[PDB]
Amino acid sequence: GTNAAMRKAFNYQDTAKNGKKCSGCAQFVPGASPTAAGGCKVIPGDNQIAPGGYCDAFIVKK
Amino acid sequence: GTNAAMRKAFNYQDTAKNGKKCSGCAQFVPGASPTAAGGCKVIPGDNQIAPGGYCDAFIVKK
């Protein structure tokens, strides 16, 4: 399932934005494997977050 | 929202069981902060899973 509202609020996209992507973001909750879709701490109920996606809420992880 | 049917299936509770709680479970999908409600792989369509809750499907995260 996806959280359409939130994805739209953050202008989520399935592709990276100039090297910026979910897999390198502090909010990402990775799936069972690298290429698996995961979750996001700020997009509740969404389990279709692509590791190579991106949104306005991105924050480089440490 | 919550998924009352799935919560009932796994005997979800809002408190921990012998120290076991959602925030320490491998099926948990954390919310924005460690204390915010999150999601769970075993209770689809529920975004009100308490980090201090528990269910029979608990599995320690390693």
Ligand code: SF4
């Ligand atoms: S905040 Fe945006 S960039 Fe970061 S993991 Fe969630 S969807 Fe991806």
Ligand code: SF4
């Ligand atoms: S499986 Fe049960 S204990 Fe684990 S996160 Fe889901 S509700 Fe909580």
